[PDB]
Amino acid sequence: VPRGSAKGDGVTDDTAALTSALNDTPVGQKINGNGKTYKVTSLPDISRFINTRFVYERIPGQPLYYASEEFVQGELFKITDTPYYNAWPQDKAFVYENVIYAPYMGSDRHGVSRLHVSWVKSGDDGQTWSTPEWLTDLHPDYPTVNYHCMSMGVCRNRLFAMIETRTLAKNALTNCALWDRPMSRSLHLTGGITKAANQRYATIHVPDHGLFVGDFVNFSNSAVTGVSGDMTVATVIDKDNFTVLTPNQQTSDLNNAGKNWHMGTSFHKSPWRKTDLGLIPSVTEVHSFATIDNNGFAMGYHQGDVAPREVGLFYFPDAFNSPSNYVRRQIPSEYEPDASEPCIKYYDGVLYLITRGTRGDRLGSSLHRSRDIGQTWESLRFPHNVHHTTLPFAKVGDDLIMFGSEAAENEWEAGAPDDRYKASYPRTFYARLNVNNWNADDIEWVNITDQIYQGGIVNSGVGVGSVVVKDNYIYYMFGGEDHFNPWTYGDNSAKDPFKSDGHPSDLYCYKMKIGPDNRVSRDFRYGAVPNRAVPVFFDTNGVRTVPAPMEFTGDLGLGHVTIRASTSSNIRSEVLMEGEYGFIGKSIPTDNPAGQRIIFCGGEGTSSTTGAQITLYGANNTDSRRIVYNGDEHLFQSADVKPYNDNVTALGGPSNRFTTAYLGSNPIVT
Amino acid sequence: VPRGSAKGDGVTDDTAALTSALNDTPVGQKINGNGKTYKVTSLPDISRFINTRFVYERIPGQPLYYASEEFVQGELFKITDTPYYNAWPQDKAFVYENVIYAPYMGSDRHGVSRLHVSWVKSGDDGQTWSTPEWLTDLHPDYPTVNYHCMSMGVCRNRLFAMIETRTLAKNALTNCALWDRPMSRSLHLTGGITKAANQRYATIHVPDHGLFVGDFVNFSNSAVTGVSGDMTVATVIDKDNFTVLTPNQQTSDLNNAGKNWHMGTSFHKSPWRKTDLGLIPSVTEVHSFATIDNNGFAMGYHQGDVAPREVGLFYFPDAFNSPSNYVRRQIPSEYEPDASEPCIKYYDGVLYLITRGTRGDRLGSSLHRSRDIGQTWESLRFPHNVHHTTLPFAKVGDDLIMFGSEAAENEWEAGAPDDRYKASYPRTFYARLNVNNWNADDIEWVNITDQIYQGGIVNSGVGVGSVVVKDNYIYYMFGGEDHFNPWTYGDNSAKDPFKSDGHPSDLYCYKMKIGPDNRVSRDFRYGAVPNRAVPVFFDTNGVRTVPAPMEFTGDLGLGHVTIRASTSSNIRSEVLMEGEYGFIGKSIPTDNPAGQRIIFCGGEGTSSTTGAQITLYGANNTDSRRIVYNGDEHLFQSADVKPYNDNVTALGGPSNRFTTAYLGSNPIVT
Amino acid sequence: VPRGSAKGDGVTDDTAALTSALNDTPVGQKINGNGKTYKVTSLPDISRFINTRFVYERIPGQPLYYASEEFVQGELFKITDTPYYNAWPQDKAFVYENVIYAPYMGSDRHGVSRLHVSWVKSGDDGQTWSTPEWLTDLHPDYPTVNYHCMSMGVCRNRLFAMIETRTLAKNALTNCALWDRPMSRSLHLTGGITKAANQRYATIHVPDHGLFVGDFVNFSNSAVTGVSGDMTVATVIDKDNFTVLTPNQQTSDLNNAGKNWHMGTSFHKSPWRKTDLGLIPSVTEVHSFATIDNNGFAMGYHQGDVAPREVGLFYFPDAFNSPSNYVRRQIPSEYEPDASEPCIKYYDGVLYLITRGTRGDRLGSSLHRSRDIGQTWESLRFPHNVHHTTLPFAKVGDDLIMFGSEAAENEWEAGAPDDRYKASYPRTFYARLNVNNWNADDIEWVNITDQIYQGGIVNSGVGVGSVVVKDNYIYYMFGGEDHFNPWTYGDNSAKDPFKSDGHPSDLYCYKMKIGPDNRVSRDFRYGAVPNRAVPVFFDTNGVRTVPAPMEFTGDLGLGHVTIRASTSSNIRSEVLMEGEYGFIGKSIPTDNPAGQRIIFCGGEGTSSTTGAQITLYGANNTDSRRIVYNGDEHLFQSADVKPYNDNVTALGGPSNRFTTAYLGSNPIVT
């Protein structure tokens, strides 16, 4: 009887052959699939394979693909590890001057409670990531409302973001505002600065500077007197020219032609421009961002609270001169039901849009392309009711490369019921779609990594991400959980992130190679003490020292405290108390309440031999509310020594007589 | 002359062939051993091999096995990195609701000084691990005695632990207490809550709840008025039913049958139940834990201080109703000499017990099985005097899979002398033993990873670990050191963990695959800023911000301090001082002692133009112990202004006259 | 037509064949080059290859070699991650008692501003690295001058370092000092302590102890009464014997022959010996260190500010007895032009020296060997004007193994122009040179890893490193950047490390195998919370607790503060203020300035029912500069109650009359 060899054609049932091979081979051998796809009836021990893809119909009629290690050149990274509920990169990520930005929202739930629009960044092509940065503060009217953002990008050297205001009670949208800020850049330029004689303003030529009046600009080596150091834009002449006010004037014209200098900009020292758009009608969420040209961009949106549902985009044709002017453009009505959160991108004059499907029992995600910024569209429906995921994407060559994630295990397929309130391992997929062929019937979703859905609450932070390309790599930034329960059902219904393990949702990045890497590897194993967030150095005396300024906003308990010399040429130690008032008080002692007091002293110890003392006694002291003032002089300056009330308290007592009173005149007795 | 090919049969001396192969092949080639075992006379360059095992008799007559990379599907992780002496997972680890728990002891030595019973946890199947948690405080009678624990596990949804009290002076056992606490769980249930009309108690049906009166329970969506929020157990009816006191009553009966709701529990908001067992006679250590059924469990023990030595277990048949009732069961007397620290597990009605051998020159570790919870036993001795290690284990299929570690390099073998006080690389091993065959003569110890023994002290933290299975992976949690000397012989005989590099012992976990993994990989590279222990966020002003409450118990030096608005609707800043009394004082200045003073001010600066001031002068000041009180009013409220002593001090002086005194009557002169 | 197979001979153009192979093979297949070198016209997708080297002439006539993964057994680690500008390991690294030391300089620029001579260490053969330690403080005359160091090593159990003083303004050398300190060691010894009867000194035999009078020594188990605990050296008899003063005397002679005891030493509790060498003439930098024997060592130097340039070494023949005595030795004059920063090592009586070339358009790096400590030399020039890099090295067998790094991409080659002010990926190389053959014409530079040069400033921290061997591994510790701009051109011209991402330069270590590894792997994945820098433990109450003493030197903002019991058997809470004076003040309130005040209280709350209060009112208060003193007693001790000025202020007022005054005699009215 003949056997029985694996065909790897995606159609022959290779289950038996692979089973035989696994049974016959040592467990530590890596079985090489030679880049082929093997149809099976159940997934085998995938860990024993390299360079293999499996095709499997968990649900009959719905083949999905599963990648062994090394089949794809890619790797998953964990990129945040914070106690906040960290999710929703959707759809905000971008690359700027070699830095990869993964914006997200850190909250305590699916909602805007405790929420800060945030980002982490990578300056090493995704190997390591920065300390989280808050981009927004809590709204001035917290806790009634707070901010929210799913649309962010860059246009002509400025960050643009749709900053939404929503209710904590219901996550209801109350306001839409466009916020923008110049991106920080160093520019190394030649020529372009002029300064007319006998007046103080200088004209700076910087093409597509993206700056507005009041924005920060720093200058070095200008060779134009007064154009130096930290400055601000005084006027904007046009898109390529601006002026600054210098502190001085010269008797001849100045012009730095041929001279090499440096500028200049700062996100952090420039204000946001905030353009109120009000409560944009028929909008549930603004989501995703597509830079169109030097002047503007599009943002996605959907309306999904009332009939009929809308899905489309808002095009801001000139966001520089006219931030408040946009045009609503919808996808074809056929594709709007059961759809939300479109991802949009613009390439080579084509605007591509992919929806999220809302139900696994109705037609789901669809793809659309337009050559007129959304006025007309060509469309396609992904098979099998793709749902619950956004599908962020990029175009690389002739392919859209899209990524998605089920929110919990076994929800991907059409007809698959939601399976929440239990821990699971949700599948993350990618697919390629060739734009010339324009047909998704034979789309191949390849599971490349599995996440965890914790199960302690119905909601999942898994997926809902964002995609960028940098050089020859594509990046999918997205949410995943771990098995640590947030205890929402339990002792932390309030959702305090700083109790127990806080919230399990954190960010991940799948880094996938999409073209040749013509350099030797940059990869390293991280072996350092992470020393950016709280920078610690063992001083010469052997004590951990933190030189960075820091804010501790949570309640602190301290032990022995020494306040060191710090202020006014280090002449003094200094504590400053804010608020309307400060209060320094004394707890009720647990063991000896009768001793309750604070001793204040001008010297080094509790003995009053060391300095003048004032001792405030607490109510619980045996000597209740006593004050003892103990110095070798008591000198009352600038004012009379008075009793608070009139004719109620005395100077001295029968057992506490003053020896006398030195007066400039007799007592005034009335 | 014919050569000379590697046989890989474990018996042919393959040394020459492998040497030839290594000499003839490029160093970067991975030489695949095809899953075979190669006998050699010395270990070759193992790093050049994949999927290879070597058999080597370092000591003639004692073959041991050595694994190349990929021979086993496994990986070592470092799981703690703390300055404490972190060791002794033995034998405490367990898995609960998808979380892997690695309890241990963090101290400053082999002893209970500075000791906290601790754990770290993993919520991602061992890829990353949590911030250490202290489970015990320092004993109330520290530093005479402190806690200790080598036995911990879960039975019917409660953590149970043998909390020992030992002397710091000698590590002598003084007390045994069983401590237990409900494990935190979220339950998603249907029906089961009833509340009789016209009274305030509700009955909650939760099978095997494991709760006691006073334990924490949280309810959501009960559809039973008053059964809501954070509550406590008022009564326990039976193992499956308990009641709570609600705050209200209704005129009809309530019953949430068919309704979906959520509960509820908390380790942290429930007290320990502590059951004093006294100084259990003839016990040196309680060690290891075997859950038997829904009602109870067994804990290991040995007595090794006086003849004759004992080794066995304590069976607690109903630890819920009767925590103080246990039965002592010993292994066969033949196996008690030179033995300690048994590891116990229960599977399919069989109790398995493995000892630690105490000497390499006498019969060592033995294995025992019982079908009657230790009343009768079948036994076997491991060959070659296995010693100095515990042998934690799990049963997977027909195999016990056990793990052990030499404490220092080259101590494993029978007759091998202890080799301490010098740095080395101790071998960690695993073995499989088939329970049907019941014969250890041909046991194969496979070295799968090497640790470091620092050598600065005689003692080693290497090994002494604990084993769990989760899904298709087995986990060995254990100690290892690094080369950083603790300076016990040197400048830190006191063993302060927070000097220099503290103590080199930290925890590791070997994660080994023991069945098929039928999912795509979950593996990630960690690229995040660790932001759980000290959560830092760069605020909108660019300053590192920590929102978590924190306690700093070590001495602190601070620079410039601002106390921000925090308290009473943020109306005030607040400092509260604990103790019997607080003391705020002033150091002797190093450069200008003549200036020694503190200026207290109601306003923003040292100029008294900014607010009222009181200045306390130190004894070293030129104006020694002066007090200057400087306000635009001095108002003395609620009491007479008196001198402390009688007829000793005056009002005013000849060069400091008050202009007059406003009185309601003439001075009373006596 | 025949094809077309890859020859892998380094001379046949294998470009076509490899292109064909890449086109025909699945992308996930690892293409094994079989350890061969393939000539190509452009670098292919190297990531698709294992065990392959490419030879490529980016610049015609200058072949360089490029390694795929696994061609070399090696790995890159990141070893620092600090906001300081962390660079210049050159040329300071060393191994001592199994610990690998990577000293460096952490500053804010190429200069001595904010500079601390620093190190990180590895106690696990380079897998993980310690919290940075500062070795130097800021110079007493900062900010005019500060310290600098490029030469450090160990000789007879002492650390020796050339500590330079340089100007912040220009990095001009002002002073050279030799600093040395005993290295911390634990010694486990037998015999050697004697103590003569009837007197208090004991003689300690410790060969090559390297200690001086006043150095720290700790003793355990001496069996010599009084030789115990923390002690200091009282006298040094010779290199192998020293005495200590014990606190007691005995009537007979004591001698611990045959007894096992422990000693003893401490870097941290021993002072530096500092030997001022003045401004050594004709020296720009002292760089690198070569231990010669038990008595001394050599340090490299160059002079490159004025003609003629010098390059050589300073030999300190007896640095123990005569730290101030050294001899200048130069390399052959032919090799001094365009050269700096020599790396020196001593092996088997041969002193090897390698220069840095300063220009890519003139003869560059050269290699020199001497058998007379630099009096005569044999020499060689590396081809192709090796420049901008130091070439630290070690000798392993017959080979020097050297490492170097271009500072920015495409600068390595002869004639290559500097390419700064733009981000790039600089190549790091190693080479082997056989000392018997003594010919570098055919040297093969192999690119083994690529770094990042950020481009925001002209300067680069890439490279300039140091090399050690430990066991069978060689380590190259060196600088690399990331893409985070320091904003020197932008908002941080001041170079504050603690703004934004600080400085991109951090340290890396390439760990390369150079001999057989005859042990099972020690490798682990790091999965722990890093808990050395800021050690955090979740206390039994669920709050993050830091038990280590810490210094926070940057400005702090605090929220609610509780100062816990800490001092004098925990009887009190304590705050101590340093400086000439302390100041506790109150900010101007933002919202209600009219309330500006601080309430000081002896009890727990703002209600004066809880304790005695003194309230200082600010100038902005409605009651400007009021003080209210509110207690149930006001007791003025130790001094008269006086007005500050004479006959200006009163006791009481017309609406604030004291009831009377209790006096021992009538008022003295004048």
Swiss-Prot record, chains A, B, C:
Its EC number is 3.2.1.129. The active site is at 341, 356, 407. The record marks 302, 305, 309, 338, 358-359 as: Binding to sialic acid. One of its GO terms (molecular function) is endo-alpha-(2,8)-sialidase activity. Changing residue 88 to R: Almost complete loss of enzymatic activity. BNR repeats lie at residues 120-131, 256-263, 368-379. GO terms for cellular component: virus tail, fiber. One of its GO terms (biological process) is symbiont entry into host cell via disruption of host cell envelope. It is an enzyme of class 3 (hydrolase). Keywords: Coiled coil, Degradation of host capsule during virus entry, Degradation of host cell envelope components during virus entry, Glycosidase, Host-virus interaction, Hydrolase, Repeat, Viral attachment to host adhesion receptor, Viral attachment to host cell, Viral tail fiber protein, Viral tail protein, Virion, Virus entry into host cell. Belongs to the glycosyl hydrolase 58 family. This is Tail spike protein.
